Each structure stands twice: as structure tokens, then as C-alpha cells.
Amino acid sequence: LSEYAFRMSRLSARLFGEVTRPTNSKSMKVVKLFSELPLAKKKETYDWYP
Amino acid sequence: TEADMEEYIWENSSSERNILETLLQMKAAEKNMEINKEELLGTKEIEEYKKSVVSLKNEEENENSISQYKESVKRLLNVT
Amino acid sequence: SRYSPEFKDPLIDKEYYRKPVEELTEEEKYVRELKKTQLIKAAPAGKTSSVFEDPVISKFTNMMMIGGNKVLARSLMIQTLEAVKRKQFEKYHAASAEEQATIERNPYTIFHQALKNCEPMIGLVPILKGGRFYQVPVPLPDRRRRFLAMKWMITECRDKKHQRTLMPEKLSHKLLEAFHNQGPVIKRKHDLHKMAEANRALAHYRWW
Amino acid sequence: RAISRTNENDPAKHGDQHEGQHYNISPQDLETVFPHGLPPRFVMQVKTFSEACLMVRKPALELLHYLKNTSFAYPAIRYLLYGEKGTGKTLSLCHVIHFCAKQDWLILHIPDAHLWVKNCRDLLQSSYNKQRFDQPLEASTWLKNFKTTNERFLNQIKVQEKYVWNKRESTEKGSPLGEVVEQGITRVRNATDAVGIVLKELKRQSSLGMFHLLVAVDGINALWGRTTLKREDKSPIAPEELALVHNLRKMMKNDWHGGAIVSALSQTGSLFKPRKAYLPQELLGKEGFDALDPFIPILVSNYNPKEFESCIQYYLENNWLQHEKAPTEEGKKELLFLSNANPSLLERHCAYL
Numbered sequence A: 001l002s003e004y005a006f007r008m009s010r011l012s013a014r015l016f017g018e019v020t021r022p023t024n025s026k027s028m029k030v031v032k033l034f035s036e037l038p039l040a041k042k043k044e045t046y047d048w049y050p
Numbered sequence B: 001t002e003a004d005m006e007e008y009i010w011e012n013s014s015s016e017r018n019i020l021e022t023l024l025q026m027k028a029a030e031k032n033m034e035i036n037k038e039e040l041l042g043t044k045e046i047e048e049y050k051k052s053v054v055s056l057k058n059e060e061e062n063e064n065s066i067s068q069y070k071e072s073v074k075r076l077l078n079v080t
Numbered sequence C: 001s002r003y004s005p006e007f008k009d010p011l012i013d014k015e016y017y018r019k020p021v022e023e024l025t026e027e028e029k030y031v032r033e034l035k036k037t038q039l040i041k042a043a044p045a046g047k048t049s050s051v052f053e054d055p056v057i058s059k060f061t062n063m064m065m066i067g068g069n070k071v072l073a074r075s076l077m078i079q080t081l082e083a084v085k086r087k088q089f090e091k092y093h094a095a096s097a098e099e100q101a102t103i104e105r106n107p108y109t110i111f112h113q114a115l116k117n118c119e120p121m122i123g124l125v126p127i128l129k130g131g132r133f134y135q136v137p138v139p140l141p142d143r144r145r146r147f148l149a150m151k152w153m154i155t156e157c158r159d160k161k162h163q164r165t166l167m168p169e170k171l172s173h174k175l176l177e178a179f180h181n182q183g184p185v186i187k188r189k190h191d192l193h194k195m196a197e198a199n200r201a202l203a204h205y206r207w208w
Numbered sequence D: 001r002a003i004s005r006t007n008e009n010d011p012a013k014h015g016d017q018h019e020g021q022h023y024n025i026s027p028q029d030l031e032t033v034f035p036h037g038l039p040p041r042f043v044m045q046v047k048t049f050s051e052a053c054l055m056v057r058k059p060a061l062e063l064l065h066y067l068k069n070t071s072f073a074y075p076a077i078r079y080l081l082y083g084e085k086g087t088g089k090t091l092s093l094c095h096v097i098h099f100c101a102k103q104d105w106l107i108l109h110i111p112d113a114h115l116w117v118k119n120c121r122d123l124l125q126s127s128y129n130k131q132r133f134d135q136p137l138e139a140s141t142w143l144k145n146f147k148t149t150n151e152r153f154l155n156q157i158k159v160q161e162k163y164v165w166n167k168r169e170s171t172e173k174g175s176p177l178g179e180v181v182e183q184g185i186t187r188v189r190n191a192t193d194a195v196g197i198v199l200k201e202l203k204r205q206s207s208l209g210m211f212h213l214l215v216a217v218d219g220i221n222a223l224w225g226r227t228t229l230k231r232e233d234k235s236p237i238a239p240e241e242l243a244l245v246h247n248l249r250k251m252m253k254n255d256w257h258g259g260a261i262v263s264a265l266s267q268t269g270s271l272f273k274p275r276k277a278y279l280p281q282e283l284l285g286k287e288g289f290d291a292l293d294p295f296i297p298i299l300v301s302n303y304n305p306k307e308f309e310s311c312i313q314y315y316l317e318n319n320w321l322q323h324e325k326a327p328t329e330e331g332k333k334e335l336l337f338l339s340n341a342n343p344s345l346l347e348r349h350c351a352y353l
């Protein structure tokens, strides 16, 4: 793997909707806590009890 | 990076350099000094070798592919 | 489970099916059988119809096996058979002419003679009477004697040993000692016979 | 009744009429031509019979018809004897080495390339062979047995280049190579310097007609296969990081004349290879496919009945099949069934039966 792959991955990141510059998996924690919902707001959690 | 190339193009390929050094060493062995690699390309043996390495590197390895490889290198190396 | 009543036992003898047309008792038996041609038990994965197989070696295999490694028991039985064959042939290479003609090279009949050496003949039972346990001599059934000999060879191969020597050489040297009437399983057999001699006045305590 | 042992030890006299022949080799001859490398499960056969009796395998003879007429003008010519596992790939190289010592060639025998890769525990670096890690112990395995392969032609070599040995010693000029290979076998710190300087000196004198050099290397899939030996911070290396074997890879590049190198692909310790891969490109890899230096692939096949019937009928004069009903005809067809006319799986049965 070299920059041929790095540039293909970067342009498919600008294409398909991922982040183009590389980052840590600890910083991908924020994109997976932002690509879904918080725990409290789900219709089967705060409305567990009617 | 040629890792992303899929087919075996004979242009500046490594086994091409091996059979090319083989043609230079063989034409020195015969002491007949007609050293033109572009004339050495014109033989039937090296292009049967070229089709055999192309077929062997793209199509995965079967017995009859090795029969074709053996036939090419056998008429190539002056072996009976 | 999951077998049922009337299900029959396996048959292996091919030549028995080749020419059964000579008698009348078993002839009418297999007339009665094929007239029914019942739901038989399926043939197990341990036995075959071949002529290169032996029942006693497969039993000593299965009595040698720990758990579910039929492959390791197969490797041990194969290695010990070949090693004892090559020890007898290496003694053949260091033999004279009559020593060529008197040393046996088949490991199979040597092994079966070794088991017949290994076989206990008079047994024990703990019987309680007058509050004490008394060791009584009892004659044994045949399957008991042969089972005891096979497990005796197994366990004295296993644990009465050094941690240095590997198992197929170990079992080969054990069979070699058991083949010549001087192995330690024979000495244990002699102690068993000696103590069944020693408690000879207890043989009226058996009720059968 | 198979024609087995009337043909004596003569690899220069194997015809196609001579088929299925258990040719007897004298055991002193194996002290000369094969103490270096042999399969480990084959040593049981010889010391039990005192008959080094190799049956005529038709590809084992067929490579010799390419060694009568391979000219010494032509360079180092590769040959591979591959096939299914157990067909005697490592045993089909054994048929040609006995010819080349009968024709007085230079036997660069390598026992097993897998042991050069795996299972070597103690590790040194280098300074004279350009700063790479190397095994002095595997050099110590090779340098002792190599001399007694060929002893007539190793001392006739003149070392025509002044090599530096230590800060106390060097090398003397025009010396017999029988000195130079074993001059530092005592000083094992640079006994791995005794391989790459020395075998490249045998490259130069191979060009003339006094010496006929042939690489005899077994299992070349490990020479271009990625190794398992690790470094101190748990980093694996390349096969191009071993200075013991890095100069060994210089040899299969046809850079000398006068001989015809033979190699045999093996399947004992093919690391990171599936067991069901048995072909050359499937085992050597991509680095074993570009640097091929065009080689002739010899597909070692399975038996015909002519090699099958020769086998058990040989074991009958030796009284080897000790079973009662084993020489019956159908008892041959089950060994023909369970061993599928493969040589190595038949000997496993004829080990114990």
C-alpha cells in the first residue's frame, strides 16, 4: 500500500461520504456517537413505562 | 504502484528481463555475437514463453498450462 | 436408543455370503432372515470388511484412546507396530542361519502370543463376612481375562515409567518384555497368582 | 517377477528398457554422494535392508536425458521436479545427483531450504556480508557435509581473490578451497562469511571446462517465501534480510556457464502454504515466479502399474509383507486402493504391515 491507495481512498472519501484526512479510532468514536442517536431519546427507552 | 495493475503486461516485466539476460548469455555461449534484443524478441520461443507467463499469471495454475510452459522452455533451451 | 427391538448385529464375512448353500440349519435361518430382511443396525465407523484388519488390535486401540483423538491412537498403534517389526528385523540382520529360521517377524502373532502371556487366569473379589473383607480366589470368564491383560499392558505402558521415553518405543519395549515371559506384567501376574495361592483357604466363601 | 535388481549402479546406463528396476547402490557410494541431504523418512528403508534400491521412475530417468546433452557452453539451467506430495519429489532429485558424481560434476548440494528458514534459535548479525542478520549455526551445518560430497574437485579450486578474514587473519592466494571452506569453521563468528565469499568464487571457475557446477537445492519455495523468524521488538523480517541466504539467491540467475542446476520443490514445511497447494507457482510465490531464470518444470506423476507391480514383488523376496493373506490378488488391490499408487503412503503401510 502506498499513496496510490491513499489517494484512491481519499477521493472515495470525498465521494462516498467518509472523512478524507486520516484520524484515530478514538476520534472515530465521535463520528459513531454522531452517526446514530443518544441512548435517552429512543422511543422504547424514555417511553419504556407509559 | 504496479500492485494495482491487474494483467501481466510484458513491458518492463521481470521474467522478460530474465529471458532477456538468458538470450544474451546464450548468444555469448554460442559465441555468435548477433546481440540485438529486438531481433531476439522475434523468435517463436520467447513469445511462446510470453504467452505462457501471461496465461499462467492471469489464469490460475493448471496442468496443461505447465505443459505449454514446458514445451516453450524445452524448445527454447536447446533441450531434446 | 436410537435403535429398537429385533435389530440385528453386523456381518462382515464376505465369503459367508459367497457360499452359504452347503448346510440346512443356517440355510433355513437365512431363508427366514431374507424372508424378513429386517431393519438391521448400520455398520460402525471402526470396523470394515477387509482382510487386513484384526479385532484385538482395534480393541487395544479403543482401550488405548483418551477421549476423541482416534487419529492419535491410530498414530500410536501404527508407530508401535512398525517399530517392533523393525526391531525384529534388525535382530534378523544380527542373526545366524538357525537364528534366521527361529526369530519371528510377524508383529501380529507375536502380539497375540504376548497377550496370551499377559493373561490372568485366577481372580479376586471382595466379599464381606463377619465384618471383615476377605480376598477370595475366583476363576474368571474369558472376556474378563483378556480385558484385564489388555488394560494391564495399557496402564503399565502409561504411568509406570520415566518422563524421558516416548510412548511407541515405550510400548514396543513393553511388548518385547511381555513376549519373552519376563516382562513386569508377568511379574504382576505372578504376584496375583501368588496371593490367590496365599488365600487358598478362602475359596469356600464363594456362593457360586 | 518384476525386473528389479539385475541393473547395477550405473546412472550412465539407464535405458527405457530398464524400467521398474531396483538398482542396488553400494552403501559406501552414499557416503560420498548423499550424506548432505535426503528425506528423513527414507533412512528407515536402507538401514533395514542394506539395499539402496531406487526403482526406475520414468521422470527420474527422463531428466538424465536432458543431462547427457545439456552443453557446458550454456549457462546455469534450472530444473524443477514438482508434483503431488509424497510422489518422491525429494527422491527424484536423488536420481540425478548420482549421475553428476558419476560424470564428475560439481555438486552444490543443499539439504533442505526449509531448515535454513524455520527453527533456528541463535542469531548473529554481519559486518562483512553487508550488515544483515545471518545464521552461523546453519552455515556450520552446511560447511561440514559439503566437502565430503565432492573431495576431488574442491581442492583443485584456486581462490583467485584476496578475501579478508579477520583483524588478525586474511586468506592466502591460490589456496585449495578445501582449506578456505574449513579455515574458519572453528571460528564460527564468521563461518557465515565462509559461504557468500566462497560460493561466489565457485561461480568464476565454473565458466571453464575443468568444473561443472550445479545448484542442488531442495524445496525452493522457502527461498522466496516469507519467513517466521522474528526480531527483538516482535518484527518479522524478509527472506532478503538473511545474509546467509541473500548471496545464495545470487546463484540462480544464470551468471555462470558449464553446468545445469537441479532443484526439487517439497511439501514438508511450506510455511503459509495450504496443504492442498502442490504446484511451483502455488508454493514458491510471486518472488519465486519473477526470478525463475527460465526453468523446466518436471511434473512428477503417480505410479503406473509397472511401478506399482515392481514394488510389492520386490518386497516378496525380502519376505517383508509378514501378513498371512496379504499376497492374495485382492489384498494387492486394497493397498492399490488405500495408497492410490502413491509411493510414500504405501511405505507407511509397509512400515508396519
Ligand SMILES: */O=C1/[N]C([N])=N(*)C2=C1N=[C]N2[C]1O[C]([C]OP([O])(=O)OP([O])([O])=O)[C]([O])[C@@]1(*)[O]
Residues within 6 Å of the ligand: D039, D041, D042, D045, D053, D054, D055, D056, D057, D084, D085, D086, D087, D088, D089, D090, D091, D092, D266, D267, D343, D344, D347
Ligand atoms: O525409486 C524411487 N523413487 C522415489 N521417488 N521414491 C522411492 C523410490 N524408492 C523408494 N522410494 C520411497 O519413497 C519414499 C520417500 O518419498 P519422499 O520423501 O521423497 O516424498 P516427498 O513428499 O518429499 O516427495 C520412501 O519410502 C522411499 O523409500
